[PDB]
């Protein structure tokens, strides 16, 4: 099986537990307006690769991983689109005593055997919930949030170590209603270890510019500690380790 990837960071510090080897896969079906990897969308592009090649790199960093309590992370655009390849990669990592992390948007269309097979070999999934209010979601992301929420149910329903990531963008996900909805939604499920909030940042805009596409959020400045603070409490009410 061939893997089409955008790039990889031999060892990032903000892509899950400890220091991790992150591979950014090519292609994404969503169109978040704040996406900092816009050049990650196209299905075509990015180098092809095999797990043999990947491991031939990830292993050399065993050191930083063990020492940081890290591992590897599948991210980029939407890794879940190359589910066959990813689960193969984790199967290889599992067999190296390596910890696996899947950074996804959970837009799972067909629940094939490979989905369960991937999750079977996945240690932690940082599932993004971009907006509980679908009216907003459809405009913020370009698609309904039903498939993602279903994937969330699915996960909880199988006790999968989850981290909910909620990117807080001004005027779109900073309001208190949306904060409760999330807090309520994820409360049901107890497999969601914590809720990591992420402040919006202008970056990866040039990726749009470079692609003659207009970056709408242009101008939008990052949210204030006050705001993040507010949301945090709203969610800490439902009893989550809401750590931003």
């Amino acid at each position: 099986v061939i893997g089409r990837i955008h790039s990889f960071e031999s060892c990032g510090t903000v892509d899950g537990p400890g220091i991790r080897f992150i591979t950014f896969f090519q292609g994404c079906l969503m169109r978040c307006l704040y996406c900092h990897n816009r050049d990650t969308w196209d299905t075509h592009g990015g180098k092809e690769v095999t797990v043999e090649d990947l491991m031939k790199e990830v292993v050399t960093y065993r050191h930083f991983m063990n020492a940081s309590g890290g591992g590897v992370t599948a991210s980029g655009g939407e890794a879940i689109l190359q589910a066959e390849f990813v689960r193969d990669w984790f199967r290889a990592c599992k067999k190296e005593g390596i910890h696996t992390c899947l950074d996804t948007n959970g837009f799972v269309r067909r629940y094939d055997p490979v989905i369960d097979e991937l999750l079977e070999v996945t240690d932690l999934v940082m599932l993004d919930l971009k907006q509980m209010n679908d009216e907003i979601h459809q405009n913020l992301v370009g698609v309904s949030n039903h498939r993602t929420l279903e994937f969330a149910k699915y996960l909880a329903n199988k006790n999968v170590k989850v981290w909910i990531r909620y990117v807080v963008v001004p005027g779109w996900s900073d309001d208190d209603d949306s904060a409760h909805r999330l807090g309520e939604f994820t409360r049901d499920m107890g497999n969601v270890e914590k809720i990591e909030l992420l402040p919006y940042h202008e970056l990866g805009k040039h990726k749009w510019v470079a692609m003659g596409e207009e970056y709408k959020l242009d101008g939008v400045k990052p949210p204030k500690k006050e705001t993040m603070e507010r949301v945090k409490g709203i969610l800490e009410q439902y009893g989550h380790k809401v750590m931003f």
Partner: peptide, 6 residues
């Protein structure tokens, strides 16, 4: 810098 691919 979370999830930023250079």
């Amino acid at each position: 810098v979370s999830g930023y691919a250079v």
